[PDB]
Amino acid sequence: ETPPAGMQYLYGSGEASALSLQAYQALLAHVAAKVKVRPADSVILAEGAGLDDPRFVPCGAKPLAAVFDVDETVMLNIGYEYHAARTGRGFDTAAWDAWERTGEAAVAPVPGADRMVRALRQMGVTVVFNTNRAAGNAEPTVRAIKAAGLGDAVHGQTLFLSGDDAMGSRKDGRRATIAARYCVIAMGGDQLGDFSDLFNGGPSVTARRAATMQPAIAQMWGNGWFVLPNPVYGSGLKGGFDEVFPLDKRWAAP
Amino acid sequence: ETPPAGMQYLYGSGEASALSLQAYQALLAHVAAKVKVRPADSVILAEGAGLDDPRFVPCGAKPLAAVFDVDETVMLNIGYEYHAARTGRGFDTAAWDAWERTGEAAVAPVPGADRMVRALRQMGVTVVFNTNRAAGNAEPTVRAIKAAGLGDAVHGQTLFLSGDDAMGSRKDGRRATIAARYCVIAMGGDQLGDFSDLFNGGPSVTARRAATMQPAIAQMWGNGWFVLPNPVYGSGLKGGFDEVFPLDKRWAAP
Ligand SMILES: Nc1ncnc2[nH]cnc12
Ligand SMILES: Nc1ncnc2[nH]cnc12
Ligand SMILES: [Mg+2]
Ligand SMILES: [Mg+2]
């Protein structure tokens, strides 16, 4: 038996490896330019700014930082997805809670994520993690991040988890806390919720894809917001046939 | 019924859209820097240069150009993959040959690929396509490229297809022809064979992934070689369990 195709790609292929290394290379070059010249806008949206008319929290004189999602952005959850491939039970809240507590032995860095995290700190940029892992599992998450070669994270200062506020999986509140004390010059993630909660909680698969091509949002990709692949799970694996294949681009073999 | 997960991601998700827009943004910024200052090395490997010790064809005073694979790099083959999702017969040489001849009506641009192709030509950079589509289907391929908003391609000058030499799917010979008359400052692709044939024809899934992290090769991603996602088909969807999930990163739920 062979693993699911999405796992073959993300965890096995050199295509996905080069895809990840490219994103970090662009991130390191973008941060370096912002270290030499501090911008006026940070890369975190201001509160009340919709996807229709985007506006950002100002940078000011706050310390420079970069926000990262953890799972499948800087850290590969190889151990859990191996269990998902063996079982088929990918969506399991009880199994994932155990993985958050006992998975520090089976984690790997996204290709180049350990190298960029060191470069960001040698550049004087603080590395902040904003993950939907549970606040109750903060200590095993810190150990897993350390075991992935991603440095030392501290709960409340450089690590913000689900449950730190009364908003659940919504990360806008935690992004507001980070931007209130840091000037975030770059933000990485593998799901659109890692850049704005406005991509989720309503918009359809067709609407979310169009939202990324909003010219004010489109200018962010590779230029402030940095994306990494995840065809294994999450909000990217949704939609039926009429949403994946538009009816004006359909074809039948003879 | 829902389409395969990889197709949900690549063709439906906004995550894959932002992933593609990021790659082109980095490509446009890289090309602009090379227009202001022409480099000494092009991004095409010299003949006889192995992945162990990489070396590149010099740039010289040749016209600046950028090489692109077509399928799932600049053009989405929505119509064919819709047929693959309906049928399950993804690997079909007879059906794909028909798609090369009759698919110009069901193609779309990769997000931002039509915008970058115009920007490259407004910058004075020639856009060259190196695809494994058949040379016998060059004219319907030209029409499909045009229908995707990717400009005008010419067979033999800006379009090089499988069969133009006696090497089949190997693209190194066609890359040698392009680099002999152009200074290629950027090259995009969704499979590793779009950058060097040395990634294929032998190396295992584990070996190919490690090859992308060769420091001389690793410096190219997002900095000369630009990658786009394809978890739907190709050399990225290979390998068994021992190659996707290394044995030191395995885990079992309680
Ligand atoms: N339930 C889940 N939670 C988080 N990541 C996952 N990946 C696959 N299933 C998951
Ligand atoms: N046989 C094939 N040739 C090219 N692209 C494909 N995508 C899926 N199957 C394919
Ligand atoms: Mg994640
Ligand atoms: Mg291709």
The three state secondary structure string of chain B is: CCCCHHHHHHHHCHHHHHHHHHHHHHHHHHHHHHHHCCCCEEEEECCCCCCCCCCEEECCCCCEEEEECCECCCEECHHHHHHHHHHCCCCCHHHHHHHHHHCCCCCEECCCHHHHHHHHHHCCCEEEEEEEEEHHHHHHHHHHHHHCCCCCCCECCCEEEECCCCCCCCCHHHHHHHHHHCEEEEEEECCHHHCCHHHCCCCCHHHHHHHCCCHHHHCCECCCEEECCCCCCCCCCCCCHHHHCCHHHCCCCC
Query: What experiment produced this structure?
Result: X-ray
A24 close to ligand 1 (CB < 6 Angstrom)? no
A96 close to ligand 1 (CB < 6 Angstrom)? yes
Report the first-to-last Cα separation within chain B, whole angstroms.
32
DSSP A161: E
Among protein residues, the one whose CA lies closest to atom 6 of ligand 2: B233
State whether B22 and A191 contact (CB < 8 Å).
no
Of A4, A12, A105, the CB nearest to B209: A12
Of A219, A240, A251, the CB nearest to B106: A251
Residue A66: strand, helix, or coil? strand
A99 close to ligand 1 (CB < 6 Angstrom)? no
Single-letter code of the amino acid located at B31: V
Q: Which of ligand 2's atoms lies nearest the C-alpha of B71?
A: 5
B5-77+107-230 topology per CATH = Rossmann fold (3.40.50)
Q: What is the dihedral of CA A151, A156, A160, A162, to 10 degrees?
A: 130
Phi and psi for A173 in degrees, rounded to 5? -65, -45
**How far is it, in rounded angstroms, from Cα B242 to Cα A2?**
10
Token readout for A178 is 């980070």
State whether A15 and B236 contact (CB < 8 Å).
yes
**How far is it, in rounded angstroms, from Cα A164 to Cα A178?**
12
DSSP lists the bridge partners of residue A58 as A41
DSSP A155: B
Q: Is B114 exposed, middle or buried (0-12, 13-18, 19+ CB in 10 A)?
A: middle
- Nearest chain B residue to A108 by CA distance is B249
Phi and psi for A160 in degrees, rounded to 5? -125, 120
Deposited resolution, Å: 2.7
- Please, what's the b/e burial string for A48-57 (b: 16 or more CB within 10 A of its CB; e: otherwise)? ebebeebebb
B99 close to ligand 2 (CB < 6 Angstrom)? no
> How many contacts does A have with B, using Cβ atoms within 8 A?
300
Is B26 within 8 Å of A26 (Cβ atoms)?
Answer: yes
Contacts of B19 (CB under 8 A, 6+ apart): A19, A221, A227, A228, A229, B228, B229
Chain B environment of A114 (Cβ under 8 Å): none
**How far is it, in rounded angstroms, from Cα A164 to Cα A135?**
6
Token readout for B175 is 């890359």
Give, as residue ranges, everything with CB less than 5 Å from ion ligand 4: B 69, 71-72, 190
Q: Minimal CA–CA distance to A85: which of B8, B243, B118, B187?
A: B243
A233 close to ligand 1 (CB < 6 Angstrom)? yes
B241 close to ligand 2 (CB < 6 Angstrom)? no
**How far is it, in rounded angstroms, from Cα B15 to Cα B35?**
30
State whether B25 and A223 contact (CB < 8 Å).
yes
Q: Minimal CA–CA distance to A15: which of B150, B213, B85?
A: B213
Which ligand has the nearest atom to the CA of A171? 3
Q: Which of ligand 2's atoms lies nearest the C-alpha of B90?
A: 9
Q: Residue A229 CA to chain centroid, in angstroms?
A: 9
C-beta pairs of A1-5 under 8 Å, 24+ apart in sequence: A1/B240, A1/B241, A2/B239, A2/B240, A2/B241, A3/A85, A3/B239, A3/B240, A3/B241, A3/B244, A3/B245, A4/A85, A4/A232, A4/B5, A5/A231, A5/B4, A5/B5, A5/B6, A5/B231, A5/B232, A5/B237
Q: What are the start-end ranges of the H helices in chain A? A: 5-7, 14-36, 78-87, 93-102, 113-122, 138-147, 172-181, 205-211, 215-218, 241-244
Positive or negative CA dihedral for B180, B186, B189, B195?
positive
Is A146 within 8 Å of A114 (Cβ atoms)?
Answer: no
- Nearest chain A residue to B99 by CA distance is A253
> Number of H helices and number of E strands within chain A?
10, 9
Residue A118: strand, helix, or coil? helix
**How far is it, in rounded angstroms, from Cα A38 to Cα A186?**
12
- Please, what's the b/e burial string for B215-224 (b: 16 or more CB within 10 A of its CB; e: otherwise)? eebbebbbbb
State whether A251 and B103 contact (CB < 8 Å).
yes
Q: Write out the CATH class of domain A5-76+108-231.
A: alpha beta
State whether B249 and A107 contact (CB < 8 Å).
yes
Q: Minimal CA–CA distance to A71: which of A148, A173, A124?
A: A148
